[PDB]
Design a protein around this motif. Structure first.
Motif, short mmCIF file in Angstrom:
data_model
loop_
_atom_site.label_atom_id
_atom_site.label_comp_id
_atom_site.label_asym_id
_atom_site.label_seq_id
_atom_site.Cartn_x
_atom_site.Cartn_y
_atom_site.Cartn_z
N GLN A 155 0.84 -1.23 0.00
CA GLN A 155 0.00 0.00 0.00
C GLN A 155 0.86 1.26 0.00
OE1 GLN A 155 -2.48 0.98 3.29
NE2 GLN A 155 -4.02 1.87 1.93
N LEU A 156 0.21 2.42 0.01
CA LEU A 156 0.92 3.69 0.01
C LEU A 156 0.37 4.62 1.09
CD1 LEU A 156 3.15 5.27 -1.27
CD2 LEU A 156 2.66 3.17 -2.54
N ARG A 181 -9.98 12.37 -1.98
CA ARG A 181 -9.30 12.23 -3.26
C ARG A 181 -8.66 13.55 -3.70
NH1 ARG A 181 -14.50 9.82 -6.03
NH2 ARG A 181 -13.47 10.18 -8.05
N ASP A 182 -7.68 14.01 -2.93
CA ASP A 182 -6.99 15.25 -3.24
C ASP A 182 -5.66 14.97 -3.94
OD1 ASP A 182 -5.08 17.75 -1.74
OD2 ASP A 182 -6.84 18.21 -2.98
N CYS A 183 -5.59 13.83 -4.63
CA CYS A 183 -4.38 13.44 -5.34
C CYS A 183 -4.63 13.40 -6.84
CB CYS A 183 -3.90 12.07 -4.84
SG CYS A 183 -3.95 11.89 -3.03
N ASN A 184 -5.84 13.03 -7.23
CA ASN A 184 -6.21 12.96 -8.64
C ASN A 184 -5.29 11.99 -9.39
OD1 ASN A 184 -7.35 13.66 -11.23
ND2 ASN A 184 -7.85 15.66 -10.36
N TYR A 185 -4.76 11.00 -8.68
CA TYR A 185 -3.87 10.02 -9.28
C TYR A 185 -4.67 8.82 -9.80
CZ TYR A 185 -0.33 12.67 -6.71
OH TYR A 185 0.47 13.67 -6.21
N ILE A 186 -3.99 7.94 -10.53
CA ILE A 186 -4.63 6.76 -11.08
C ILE A 186 -4.61 5.60 -10.09
CG2 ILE A 186 -4.76 5.21 -13.06
CD1 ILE A 186 -2.45 8.21 -13.18
N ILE A 187 -3.41 5.21 -9.67
CA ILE A 187 -3.25 4.11 -8.72
C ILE A 187 -3.26 4.61 -7.28
CG2 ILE A 187 -1.73 3.12 -10.48
CD1 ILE A 187 -0.57 5.46 -8.76
N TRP A 188 -3.76 5.83 -7.07
CA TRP A 188 -3.82 6.41 -5.73
C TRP A 188 -5.01 7.35 -5.61
CZ3 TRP A 188 1.94 7.19 -6.76
CH2 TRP A 188 2.67 6.10 -6.27
N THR A 189 -6.17 6.81 -5.25
CA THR A 189 -7.38 7.60 -5.10
C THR A 189 -8.00 7.44 -3.71
OG1 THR A 189 -7.75 6.65 -7.30
CG2 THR A 189 -9.23 8.38 -6.66
#
Length: 28
Positions: A1-2, A10-18
């Motif tokens: 995990q991260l 969801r303040d990252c707007n990432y793909i593999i990190w939401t």
């Protein structure tokens, strides 16, 4: 995990990190 510094659910707007946890960001 991260655990990237996050603010909201969801303040990252990432793909593999939401999935944001206690001020963190991850995939799950």
């Amino acid at each position: 995990q991260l655990c990237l510094l996050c603010q909201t659910s969801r303040d990252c707007n990432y793909i593999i990190w939401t999935v944001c946890r206690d001020g963190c960001c991850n995939i799950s």
